[PDB]
């Protein structure tokens, strides 16, 4: 607008620097998401393993309890 005194080449440089900062930031976030997705799935699988084992123990108890009541 009227009275602007910033040289266009300076503005370009500010922008391209900002672009790179965001690009870097976006790639670190995508990485962080990938790593956490993998960790979460590992935890989900272990939770399921524990639950399966819990169900089996639940049924063992139910048997001992019901055959002797």
């Amino acid at each position: 607008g009227p009275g602007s005194m910033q040289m266009n080449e300076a503005k370009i440089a500010e922008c391209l620097q900002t672009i790179s900062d965001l690009e870097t930031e976006c790639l670190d976030l995508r990485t962080k998401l990938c790593d956490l997705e993998r960790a979460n799935q590992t935890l989900k699988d272990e939770y399921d393993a524990l639950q399966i084992t819990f169900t089996a123990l639940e049924g063992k108890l139910r048997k001992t309890t019901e055959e002797n009541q």
Binding site: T42, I52, A56
Partner: protein
């Protein structure tokens, strides 16, 4: 020591190597190529001929030669026995996914609910499948089981383990099947016949042919392992010869040719392959009956001949 080697395979995402022997079984981590780090051993059951892990969890299923019709499922960190099931014949394969546990006999397949290990469905009177050839998807939206639908022809039955009904039959080859593998998405099935000249990839479940990869014209081999990279872009095929072919699933002018190749230091050994990214570099892993794990580097852009970079004893020995 470990005694005779009986079994070796990779888990569903190639993060663990399982080794069964006379002495018991072991798990090794596959997060490094510089050493093969043992993360578990159990000697409570000898002569372990089948080990199947649920990914990297503590759930494991085991079969021993001392009772080859009996499957034992356990939480290996706690020792708690989950279940023990005995079948009418020798167990030939045991496969697991996050919803299902499948057991392959020569003439029947058992589909168990993994949540409670109850049998949901039995596929009875299959064409005899003495090699235990089957494949089970690890994808919950594409939760299919593939197995041979004919003893004379390379027809693939594709069974939906959620609907508990056949999803499709794929006439994949004109002679009996030799090998089968799903990719991680559950939407690609790789196949080979006993002739072994072409490796085909089909869309799952709809059944159209997506790729045909050629390794020979008149020279036949016995393909024994097909493996996808986790992203579905690469497909390896190994056999009773010294060459492993690696194919890239890309639409290309010269369709059918191998993208990369590997030369094994042996011929004529049982072997199993997988494609795994380790320490930022795609690898071809080969476990073989000579007692070794081989690790070759794959350049996913340039292909070509892959160097043998690391080799490790399957029994955990330093050399």
């Amino acid at each position: 020591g470990s005694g005779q080697l009986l079994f070796a395979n990779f888990n569903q995402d190639n993060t663990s190597l399982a080794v069964g022997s006379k002495s018991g079984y072991k798990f090794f981590s596959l997060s490094s190529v510089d050493k093969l780090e043992q993360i578990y051993e159990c000697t409570d059951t000898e002569d372990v001929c089948i080990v199947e892990r649920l990914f990297s969890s503590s759930l494991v299923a085991i079969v021993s030669l001392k009772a080859p019709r009996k499957l034992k499922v356990c939480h290996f960190k706690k020792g708690t026995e989950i279940c023990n099931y005995s079948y009418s014949n020798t167990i030939l394969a045991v496969k697991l996914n996050r919803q299902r546990l499948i057991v392959c006999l020569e003439e029947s397949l058992y589909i168990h609910n993994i949540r409670d290990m109850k049998v949901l469905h039995t596929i009875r009177e299959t064409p005899p499948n003495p090699a235990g050839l089957c494949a089970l998807s690890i994808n919950n939206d594409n939760c299919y089981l593939a197995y041979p639908g004919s003893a004379t022809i390379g027809e693939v039955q594709v069974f939906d383990t959620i609907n508990l009904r056949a999803a499709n039959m794929i006439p994949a080859h004109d002679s009996p099947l030799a090998a089968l593998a799903f990719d991680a998405s559950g939407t690609k099935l790789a196949t080979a016949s006993e002739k072994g000249t072409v490796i085909r990839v089909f869309s799952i479940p709809e059944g159209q042919k997506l790729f045909e990869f050629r390794r020979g014209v008149k020279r036949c081999v016995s393909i024994c392992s097909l493996a996808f990279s986790m992203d579905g872009m690469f497909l390896s095929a190994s056999s009773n010869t010294e060459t492993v072919h690696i194919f890239k699933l890309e639409t290309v002018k010269e369709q059918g040719r191998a993208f990369a190749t590997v030369r094994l230091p042996f011929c004529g050994h049982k072997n199993i392959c997988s494609l795994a990214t380790i320490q930022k570099i795609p690898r071809l892993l080969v476990g073989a009956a000579d007692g070794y794990l081989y690790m070759y580097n794959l350049d996913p852009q340039e292909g070509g001949e892959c160097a043998l970079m690391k080799q490790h004893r399957l029994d955990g020995s330093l050399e």
